[PDB]
Every structure is written in structure tokens, then in C-alpha cells.
Amino acid sequence: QCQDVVQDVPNVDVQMLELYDRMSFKDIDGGVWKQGWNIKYDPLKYNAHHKLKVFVVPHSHNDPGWIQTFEEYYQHDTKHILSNALRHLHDNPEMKFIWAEISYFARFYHDLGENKKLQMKSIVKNGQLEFVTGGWVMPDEANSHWRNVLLQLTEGQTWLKQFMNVTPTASWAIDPFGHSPTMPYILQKSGFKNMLIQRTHYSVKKELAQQRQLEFLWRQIWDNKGDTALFTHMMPFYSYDIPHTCGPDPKVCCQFDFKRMGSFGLSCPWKVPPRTISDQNVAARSDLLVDQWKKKAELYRTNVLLIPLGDDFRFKQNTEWDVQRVNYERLFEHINSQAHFNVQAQFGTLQEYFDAVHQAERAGQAEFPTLSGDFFTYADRSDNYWSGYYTSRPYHKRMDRVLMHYVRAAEMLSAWHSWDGMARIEERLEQARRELSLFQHHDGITGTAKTHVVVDYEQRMQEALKACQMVMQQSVYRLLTKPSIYSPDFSFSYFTLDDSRWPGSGVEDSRTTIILGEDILPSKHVVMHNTLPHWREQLVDFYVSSPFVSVTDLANNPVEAQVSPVWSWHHDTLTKTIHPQGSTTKYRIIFKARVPPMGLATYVLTISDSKPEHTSYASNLLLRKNPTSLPLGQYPEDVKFGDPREISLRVGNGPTLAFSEQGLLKSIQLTQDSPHVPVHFKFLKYGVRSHGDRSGAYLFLPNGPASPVELGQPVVLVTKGKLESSVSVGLPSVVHQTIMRGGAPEIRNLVDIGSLDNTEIVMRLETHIDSGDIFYTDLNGLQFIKRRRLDKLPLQANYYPIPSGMFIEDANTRLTLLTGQPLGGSSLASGELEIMQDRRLASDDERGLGQGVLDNKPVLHIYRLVLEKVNNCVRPSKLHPAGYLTSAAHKASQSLLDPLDKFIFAENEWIGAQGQFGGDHPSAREDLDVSVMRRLTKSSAKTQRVGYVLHRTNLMQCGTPEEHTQKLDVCHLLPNVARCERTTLTFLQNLEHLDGMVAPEVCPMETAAYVSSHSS
Template structure:
């Protein structure tokens, strides 16, 4: 002890022992200290994790308001960090959430901005991930993931240039990790991904075998384009035990004056060396990472940096006494680069990291469904955003800045405590308000665009504005009620002509003229009692007009409504057998409202249903003191029993048959009902479900599922999508990566369902499509269940501090959504589920107007149909992004949305002429292909090469340079290509 103290006294007065550093030669990998090849290199990574909303709103977190809820003020964190970086050029810091940094940047002086740019250019400040937020990976759709990354990447590129371009994904806090998300990062040109959470059994196995870092082969279709070095961090994302130096930490600082009684350098150094060696035992190279920071830390950055400076100094000094530990400031990029240079071969992985559990009873599968209404609103808001961008681009209104409020709101809502449903109720309201305000701004853009597209004479803009009716899902559109005439304009955002069935709630009878002036058929269908009784519904409408439209690709049709007096021929029966039938399908119900079977006539496939309906799991009411007492809450799904209870022992059925639609309205009780519809030309069955207010007068939390029980022998296998794109096989009570211990029969088998789930036999496949993200599974052979809504009474002790108990109008919240059922052979299912799912997420946008004109005058004044395309693009192509950047420049993303070997026709490569998208704009005279985030030409992308233990290399061929002389674009299955196009 005395000799060790003496050694530290000697070090204190010595001038020759200093922290080994590497003076920056630039940014990125060029700025990296790669350590000593003969030592254990400890990369110290200072960081803060700043949720863009969780316990407080994003505004409150930024300004440091309401610290009684949680002490956090991001503006002070960034102020303090920049001052500390200025104090010592050896220091490093990384930052992630651009939603916060953008706000802070807008408040800075030119002097501070120049300092920050210098930090970035010298590699001292590094932006990691670079998205608007650190997004959730379970309940997010790939379109919105790409958008939120692109929003942040554009800001970084414009303000800082190439030195700020992120190369590493940093998903340290999301609750499970999707394969598609990793693939997206790889397609953005990222070299690696680090995260903090993985299943407790997975981590135990990986730490024993030193496989905490691996090559994630993140696509079954894109091969090496999707490979990503992926690492599980050693301490979640916190500092090693006893080394938190934040303002609110209780760990001892480095007290290095040996004349003082509390001098603690020897024990602090020993503890650090022990922590480094313990961590090294779990990792496979002589490089390890230590994350120094946590949630909203570094408000007093000097406190952190001063202690880390000392710690590194004294730890490295022990090398003279034989220590092999070399510690220095680093960043995630530099740590990854060091791994790349370590000449190591890596294991690989092809599945995902769902579901995530932190102990045997703690499966984080409840948030797959939590706040189902917000999940639905987020998906619908994305629909509005994409249509607004298209209208702005095709009308050439150059109002991109006016779409920013909705883009920014959507970026925030992708956060892992936003669309996930794991925020406090007040914060959820704030997210919804931001989306609503963003949509209001989008409506202004829509009106400006239609003012150019609608009039036959552009000098005469429409006198009546277009408006959205956002409550038509509950058959309410107050502005049109009782009007003698109104118009409905439908914009089709897809590159294909589509057939769609439209519902318009009305208080009177109307005839409908299509875009050619012809009166079209419509069914006047009574609005169901469950709909009319939804709390908060203000409409007097008792009927809805249902009619079919054919919409042009990337274009609109306008439909003119005017009063009429004749009656519609509608058949209605109550509590009798009911058969819904068209030329493709037959759906049978008995007189008790039980779904008996669905038959596909064309394929001669019948799927009988042993039962179909609503059930509820009772939420476990634990006190969270130990694993076995884990409660079900916002994050956790833990049912009290593996056998859910039916919501009702009986039900009623009303059978409604018109020419356009046939419908079975099935009421289970006062708070659950479904309307099962078959349209005249539909090849699938629509199920519109309504759940709520969920009763809790019995003091029992309830988690509501809609279950479809068939005779399909799926042998424990089922299939779910990943963020709306590729589909993964799931096997009940099984994990591909480790020997799974079955503890929770139900929640341990739940997976995120963003768009589809299916079960199959060799000749039959039953697929359910969803209109939002839901948790789902096949708990028993032949069965698919999807969780629709949750109301729990206990907090699960994971931070949010509230049960998931949503209310509205002084009672439990009512949620309504849709499923779409497809009965097909496995060989032909992809054609139907791919197309139908794509159109569920990107539906025609309906805007209404109240022109005070007769139809004759209206048709002479306004264009009633328009399309940007002369001819549809191939069916397996989807236009993901069409956005005007400035007067003559556009950002385009085109995707092939079929997988390999799904369909004999549509799973093949496809070629099309990009000029066809610009037939209304002019001639393309400039084109650059970009990475997926849109922030770098693909020809400039130089990803690191990795080698697997099977001697496979991640190296790819350089892409072909684009030229305006050849605009034929080739797309392979699941490929997304991004272009910046300049038009004359």
C-alpha cells in the first residue's frame, strides 16, 4: 500500500508521464487514436443520451423546465460540453439527437458556430447516427425511419459538410432491434451499429463466447449491401460501476492530492483496471469501449472531463509498473475503426433481436401495441406527409419549408419513447398535437398545389379551399353535413392505377358524379350503433355513402356530390345466417355472429374458423420487486394467464348487403365490435375493429386481442414483417441464436407486426394485414392473434411511472383500426399481401371542398382528373419519396418492394425509365445517385471491409455512375435507390 502510494506521488510530480494522445489530422477515421497493438486499449466515449420526449415534452427537456419531474436541460448540456471541449483539445464527445442539436444551433452566435465547426473538423465532436431522434425499431415503419434519418443528415451536411456525416448507428436505448433497421443503416453507408439492450439470455451466452460483436447480415435479399458490424455495449450505455462523474452521481471523484486524508487514486485506478479486464473477458479483441455518460448527463461537463482526464493520466501511468491497459478519449467511430484494423474474423447473425427481455418475466412486448391510437395517427400522418410532398413537387409550388413542421413532428414521433407508446400521457398528447399542427401546415401546401392543378385557367384559383376530414374513420365530417353540394378530391400517391372503395358520412342522400360527369353507383349504408355511440362523436350523420373509384397513378380525380331523392336498395337482416360473396370470395357467418369459413373460389381454398373474435388477457399486477413480481405495463406484456378470456359469451350480427359492399356488423358487448366487409371486386376481407372504453371497474387491467383460429397446421411456425418490408420466420418457444428458456408462454412469443403476419401449410396461407403496428403471435397452431388495445392499472417500474391507462371524454379511450384478411396459396400470396399492404400504408388522400357552383359551372372551371404519368410503372415498383428540393431539383426514392423468390413474376429485377416520372416537369439534365439517407453520392461511399469466420468478405463492387444519357433504372428485389434529379 505504501509503495503504491509512493508511486503515485512520484507520478504526480513527474513531467514525463502524460496521457498518450493523437493530435488530429482531420475528421472521421483520420482523427482516430488506434491505441497500442500490444496493450488492452480502452476507448473512453463521453456521451449523453437525450430522449426527445419521455417523462417531459421535448420542449421541457430542451429548456430544463419542470425539473420536479426529471432534472434535464439539454441546452445546458450542449453549452457545457462545448466549453469543456474548448478547454482541452484531447477531449472527445459524441452527440446523437439532431432534434435537440438543431434547436441549440439556431440559438448560437457565429463565434460559437465557428468553434463547433472546428471541433467537428478536428474529430473532437462527432455526430453518431445523426437522425432527428434515436428511433424505436419495433413499431416504426421503414418509410418514416428513412425520413427521420434523412432530416438529421441533411442538417448535418448543410451545416458541417463531410466531417459531420455519421458512419455509425447508435441505438443504445431502444427495446429490441429489427433486422430491417440494420439494413437501412447499411444502405445509408454506415459501417457499424452499437446498442445497449439485448435479451438477458443472449447476452449471457455472447459474453461467455466473446461474441458481443458480430457481422449482422441484415437482409435476405441485399447480400453484402446490408452487412453491418454490430456490437452489444458492455454496460448498457452507462459508465462502469463507480465511475459516473455526473452532477447527480454519488461515485467518488478522483481525489489526487496525496497530502489529503481522502486521497483515493490507488483504489480508483485498481477499480478501473479490474473493470477493464473484466470487460475484456467478454470481447474478442484488445480493444474495448467504455461509455461515459447516461440519460441527460453532462449538464456540468467539466465535472466529467476533469475526472476523466485524471483517471486516464493515472491509469496509463501504471504501464511503467507492468499494466497492459492503455486508456484514451475516443468515439464510437474510432472504436469501430480500431476493431476493423484488429485483423479479426467475426461470427455472423441473420435473425433479429426480438423479443427483448431483461429477466425471465420481463418481456418488452407490450409496447408493440401501447397507445394504439397514437400508432395509428402516426401512420396516417406519414400518409399526409408523403402526399403533400408529391403535390408540392408536381404542382411546382416550391413550398418545401412549409412541409417542415410535419416532417419535424414525424421525426420526433419516431423516438423510442414516442410511437412506442412508452411516454407519459401528457407527452403523448404533445406528440399528437405536433402531428396535428404539422398537418395543418401541410393542408396549406395542399391548397397551394391544388390551386395550380385544379383550375382549367391557372389565373383563376379555386375560391373554396380544400380541407381534410380526419374523423371519417368514425363516420364524421362535420363541414359537409347538410350541404347541398360538395366535392371530394382523391390523390393517389402510388405509381399504379388503383381501385378504391370510399366511405363518406352523410345526413342526406346524394348522387355522385365522377371525373367524366357520369353518375356512379353508390350504396347508402347505415352507420352502425357502435360507431354512433363512440364518445366524442359529434356528427348527425346516420348513413355513409360507399362507392368505388378508379384513380390514376400519381394523380387525382374529383367527385361532385349533389342532393337527390330516390332510394337505394339495401338488404338488412338481424341475427340470421349471413353470407358475403363476390366472384373471388365467400365469407360465411352463422346466426350467432360466428365467422365459420372463408373460401377463395379462384384457388378453391377453404379456411374454416373454429373461432374468431375478441379476447382479453388480464394484466399481471405485480409490485416489480423481483422478476416473478413483474407487472404488465407500458413496456412489459405479462398476462396473468396464458388462456385469454372471451370478451363476451354471445354476440349479435347485422347483415347488410348492397351492390358495392356487403357487411356483417358483429357486436360483442358495449366496448367491442367489428364490421367485416367484402367489396364487389375485393380479393381480401376487411375487418374494422372497435375496442373501448375497456372497463376496469373490476380493478383488473386488460389487454385486448383479436384472434383468428383456423385449422391450418402451421407446426409452431409463423411469419412477421420487419418495419413493413422483409418477412422473418418465427418459431414458437425458439430463438435461432441461443437455447431459449421458456418462461412466459404468451409474451415470450410476441413479435412486432408492422404490416403483416401469416401462417401457412403447403397449399394454404392465411395472412392478416394491419393498418398500424401491433404485437402479434401464433400461440397455438392454426391461430393468429393481434393485440389491439391495452389498459393496465400498474406501472412496470421501467421509468415511465404510469400505467398505460388512456382516457378520453371521462372514460377509457376508444380505438378503431383495420385488419385485412387474405386467403391464398403460399406461391401466390405475395402478390396480394405486398400490394395490399403497400396501399394500406399509402392510401389515397381525400380532401373536401364546398364550391358554390352547379356541376355544369364546376366542370367548366376546374380540371377533374390529372396524372403525372402517361403510363403506370411496373407493379413491383413503389415511389417511396418524391420531394421538391428547390425550383429545379428533386429527391426521388424508388423501391422494389417484393422479396426474392416470393413471386414467379414480381420477384425478378425490373427496369424503368426515370424520365417517366418527370413528364410534366421537363427533361432531366442532371442526376446523382445517393445513399439511402440522401446525404452522399453512392460513388463516394467507401465502407469498411469485414471478414467473417467463414472467410466471407463484406466488400462490394462500386456502383455504376449514373448519366442523363441512360435513365433506365434497374431495381432488384427489396432494393431502394435514391436520386437527386435536376430538371430543365
């Protein structure tokens, strides 16, 4: 019933991995079309009964932050563009305009009076102003998580449906730096019919153009049937600006950008300015322009041609609207009335273009090719590959993933109840969704904005995290307090969030110590939340004021715990070492929390005067020449010292890890019977070219392969505990930590590139896996795609986005690295994986930013490292373009991206406390997630509505027998269900009324949305 996503290789006309394997990437001068060739056309192709239909589509690219902040641009540019659009379109009925960025449109619309709102609605209604995509932003496609792509699309489309009563079905993505099939995946499931893309490698544009394969049905890589296909138009030329949109010769096209005549400070760099169209030159100018259009049309299969007309922050001035509109109207009048051109040209919208193309297709003009794959890594010219922004500003890349989780958790926790308006829950959740959605912009998460703009995004995300914390903690208080005892005040802090990994140890001393004492306060409630729809156990840790602490559950059952010191690291400028210091005033308590599906569990920490029965203490070993003592206050075990040596550790039944004398992993033995498999961590640095093109925020232009970071004799700290052990080493620019809790290790890097200008720090893994030239990287946390290292491409082209994970494998062994933040990475030799940590660039890379990247700050990167035997796994065949995680790797990814949330009760006594919430929630199969749970109605609605997005991944079968699991029917998670509907993923259209009000679970690799309606 479900499609098999593993075992059937789809047959498509263009499969991008295969196309890459065959294609030439030579950068040859193609003439006026520098990256193409001199286009020829048969003049007789067009005649009285077969005319070329041209749609000139005015647009204005508005970045929600880049060289100015969102609000700076809105005040300086965008408010003027939209005010002038409203005026000019209202006054000129044949003029059209498309608008993409709903963040700005909403910012504008809410400063409009009623009269202007009605005027605006009128030009939308009549089709003059058309929204394209309708997302809050035009998102990055490399670093963004699919959940956030959906978040921002939903934010924008919900706004448009509520205020404009429109839902776009055509998407416009002219600026993201390379393109992902995650986009058509999400769009096709959200009602879209067509999409347009632009920034693809110039060699791919040439290859596809030659074959008229620039318009294609883009299906997912595993889709044998084609049910996921979305019609896609790829623009053929170097840019979306007017010189690169009218046709192949920018010297000619520039003459048709009427903003470039002088009075607007713009000109044509090809040295021929535009001239005003008049009766004395209209025929000559028309001839020039039609010949460009006819050349562009040769690259496409129908007689319908798309001519975008715009550029960045265009259509700002009244006089600009006039100069473009009047000159084009003069051209259209001449061209259309002169039969010898056989052209009918008009202003159009994007949807108008696609409608006409499909009309032509239905008329049998053309059949379109099918395509799968992705469009990374982009290069716009020569060897200038845009793999730098897979890593740029990694602090904020990590912050994105943190906020992604806290928005999900806040929406889910608060969804269980309806809230009085005074609680301000909807206000806070809307703020958080909008700040996270804004950051998905292709100059946000990409790390390609100016320094002060990055600070604006950071501040906005900090406010969003605060809003999430507020909603979460109010929700926990409500869900775990006896209903007749619950006495909320909506401005009060019942709990504080405790997060061990953001900002992280050594980044910020943000964490609250639980203060207990025999003479003051014996015990403290803590609460864990599990956003995933299965029972979950995870070790959690808290800081406490004494090492003599016992843990119990809320039936007072003892829970095994481990206490460890609180270690921090310091670049000790006196002794010239990077070395740890232990706290003498607080300690870490660690225990396994077990939490219901989408639920909560309460535990209690209690002080004692001596070592508790069920709490053990870690040993600590400091390996270094020239040791000095490390006192630890009340901690009962003295630190031990040793000269650097190889060491091995094993927690529980789990793998045994060996470490070099520099405290870096060297090997992993999976079981007592198995071999010690070589897996070596190494840190290296890339530099920058002294002559020739410089790396910057966008571009990665290394001066050769990376060189090893010289480690000296680093200080190594070993902590050995029953529940958790770790090895940490202070290296130059990186405190590197491997943590073992009895399965796949966790890796944490506290990365501080300091003042190392023109350096990029990379973490590499070296193994004996014979992967050859193959490796796998994920796309938007949604799917893994097969990559092939090509030596016909330079090193920076073989870097790909690693938004959530990467792996290499051979017949028997796989090594998967899961990430808690998007970064760039590759496999540059058989058996290697590498992932960039940070980059500090003192030069601009000539893409408009006008600065390097010199605002680095310490960031705590997190990973899981999974080594597995895979000879028993049922994998795709050699020619299949996808890869799939194992269950262990998928759970490891979930542990990074959606960990348990931890709450500390903020006062001395919690009256009416309960031990659990969600004990009765079904525990769904491990491949299924409830990606979104969101209440859609305010508390006054008679009919309450809750939306759910359900995602089922596909995990490899490797012989672990499948346990029975419960069916999850989201429509029955809340009481009094009156209806259950399947909807588009934005919740905006009902697709199916569901029998028995039961929401079916979805197939592997499918995502479905459901809305349950409840009588209230």
C-alpha cells in the same frame, strides 16, 4: 443479375432463429456479472508490443420526450448539457463527446449567436464533438415503419450536412428495446460503415460473448452474398450506464462514475462510492479499473476496447464535466506511463474506436463472424420481456401510420411544382416531417412516455396533419385547374380532406357532409389522389345530405354507386346494450374511383329527386332479440329485423363469408367450387399478476393464457350492398366490423377499453391451418421474418412486433393479417394468429416511467384478412429465415397504409376544373413503390432537384401470369432533366452519374434513391 431472395438459404455464422432453437435461456446467477460468468484473462496477453488500446467515449443519453416533454427537457437539461459541452470541449482539446439526437442539437443551435456557432463548428471540425447516427432521434426499432426510420435519419443528416458539413458513418443505438435488421439495411444504404447496439436479450449477450461473437457483420436474412452487411458492435452488459460499461462488475465500475460521490444526489447502489483520484490512490484505482477493462476485452477479438462513459442527461453541470474529466485524466496519465499495465487509454469518439478496430482487422488480428436475424423480443432480466410496448398507447401507434401517409402524400403532391416562398409549403412540410420524425423516438411511438408527454406528441402530430392537409389541398387546386385560370390564394381552403378511417367512426365526428339540394346546389366535385406508381381502383365513400345522389366522372360518364345509411354505435346506458343508431340526416355514398399512377381523378356527385339510374341501396338487417325500430330519414329501404342467426355474405365474384350468431367470422369460401375454410374470430382478455412482476407500458407479464370475453347476446348489424357489405357487432370494449368489397375482407375494430384496469384485449383468429410452431411477422413494414413459438420461453416472449402484418401457413393454405397500425401479436398454437388491441395497466413496471397506462382512448384499428391457396406458390425452403407476401396481401397492406386520399371542393363552383392529373405517368410493376418523392430545392435555385426513393418488395410467384408493365424512370417524371444521379437514401451523396439521365429500377428487396436535376 439480381440476387434470388427466396431459394438460396444464406450461410452465416450466427443465424438468430437457429441460435434460438439451440440456445439455453436459463437465468443463472453468474456472480458479479449477474447474467454472465466470472471472466478470466491471461495477464501475459498484453505486453510492450501488444498493448490494449482503450477508447473512453463520453456521451449523454437525451430522450426527446419521456418523463418530460421535448421542450421541458430542452429547457431543464439539454440546453445546459450542450452549452456546457461547447464550453468544456472548446477549453479542453483532448476531451471528446458524442451526440446522437439531432432534434435537440438543432433546437439548441438555432438559439446560438454567431460566435458560439463558429466555436461549435470548430469542435466538430477538429473531431472533439462527434455526431453518431445523426438521426432526428434514436428511433424505436419494433413499431416504426422503415419509411419513417428513413425520414427521421434524413431529417437529422440533412440538418448536419447543411449546418455542420458532416455526415456520420457510425450509428449509436443504446436504448431502443430490441433491435431490427431494418436498421443496418437503411444505414448501409445511407453511407454507414458501422453501428452499435445494446438492448438485446441477456441470454443472447451471454451466448455471443462466450464465442466472441459480439462484433459481427450483420446481413439481411435473405442475403446470400453479403452485400448488405454492416459491421455491428453489440455491447455486452445489462445497461449503457457507467456501472455496466467499464467491465463485468458494476460494484467496481460504479466507483468510476465520478458523478456519484454525493454532491449530485446520485450514489452507488452497490455501496462503494467513487473516490477522487489522487497520488495516494492512483495506482490502486488504476489497477481496479484496468482489470475491469481487461475482462471486458476478453469478450472481443481485437486489442481495441470501447468504454462508453455516460448515462441519461449526463454532462449537464460544469462541475460534472470537471469531476469526470479530471479524474479520468489522472487515471490515463498513470495507466499509460506504467508499462506493466500494457494499456494505452484515452478519450475517444465512436468513429475513432471503429477505425481502430478495422485497422486491427486489416492487420489480421481478427476475422469477424457473419450474422443474420433480429433481436426481438428483448428481456433485460428474468422473464421480463418487453412485448408490452408493441401495443401501448395504440391510438398514437395508429396516428403514426396516418401521418406517415399524409407526409408522403403532401411531399409528393407539392413536388410537381416549384412554389413561391409566400405559399409556405417548405415551412409546413418541414414542420410535418419533424413532428413525425420526433414521434419515432423510442418513447414516442412505443407508448412509453408519461401521460402529458403522450398528449404533447399527439398535439404535435395533429398540427403536422393540418400542415399536410394544407399543402395537399393547395397542390390539388394547382394540379387540376387550367393554368391560365389558376388564381391561388395561399391561405385559402380549396378542398377539405375526407378520411373515413381516421380518427374513425365512433372516435370523432370529424367528417364533412356534402350538402346538396334541388333548391340550392345540384353537384359537388370530389378528387382522389393515388400516391402509388400504378393505376389504382379503390372504393371510396363520402357523407351526403340526400340518398338520391348520382356519381359521374369528369367526362360525365355515369359511375355505379351504392348508398348506405350512416351507422354509429352507442353504449346505451339505459337499455344496457351496445347498439347501432342510423342517421336521419346524412347518408354514405360509395363508388369505385380509378386514379392514375401518382395522380389525381375528379368525380362529381349530383342530387336527384328520386332513385338515380346508377345508384343502388343497401339492405340492412339488425339481428338481436328484442328489436326496436331504426328509422333512417329519407333512406328508401326499411331496416329488417331478425333473431340472432348464422348468416353468409358474398360481394361480387369474391369470397363467401359466414358469420356466427354473435356476428363474428366463422368461415371463408374462396370460390363457388371451394370448401368453406374455418376462420374464426374471437376476442379474449389477458390480466396481470397479483404477486410478482406487474405488466406496465413496457412489460407484458400475463397471469396465464387469455380468457374469452363473455359476449352475452350482442347486437349484430348486417348491411348488404352490391358494392360493399358488412357485419358489425357491439361487443364489450369492441365494436367489431367485417367489410366485404369483393376481395379480401377489411376488419375494423373500434376499441374502447373504458375503465377495465389491468386488462389487455386480444383479437384471435383460429383456423385449421397446420402451421405447427411457425409463424411470420414483419419487421418495420419492410420484410417478413420466420418466427418459431418456443415452449421453453414464456408466453410474453413469443409475442413479437406486428408493424404491418403477420401470417401462418401450411402446405396448402395461408392466412395473412395486414394491419394499419403496429401492435403486438403471436401464434400461440397451430392454426392461430392473435394481435393485441389495447392494454390498460394500473401499475408501474419498474422501468422508470413511474405510472401505469391509464390514459386509453377509443381507437379505430384497421386490418385486411387474406386467406389464400398457396400450394402452387414458390416459397422458400424450410431452413430459410424469411417469408414473402403474395400480390393480394401486398396490395391489401398498401390499401391500409397508403389509401387513396379524398378531397371535397370547398366552395360552390370550381372554375377551370380538370378531370385528371398523371394520366401519362408510367404504371410500374406492382412490387415497385416510389416510397419518397421530395423536391429538394427552394424556388430560387437555378437547378431544381427532386429526390426519389424506390423500393421493390419481393412477392411470391403463384402462377398468375405477369402482364407487361411500363418501366418507371423517375428521372424523367419532371420536365427539363439535366442530370440523374443515384444517391444514398438520404439524398446526401452522389453514388453514380446515370447514363442517358435514366434511373434504373431496383432488384427485389432493394431500395435505391435517385436525384434528378432540372434546369429552371
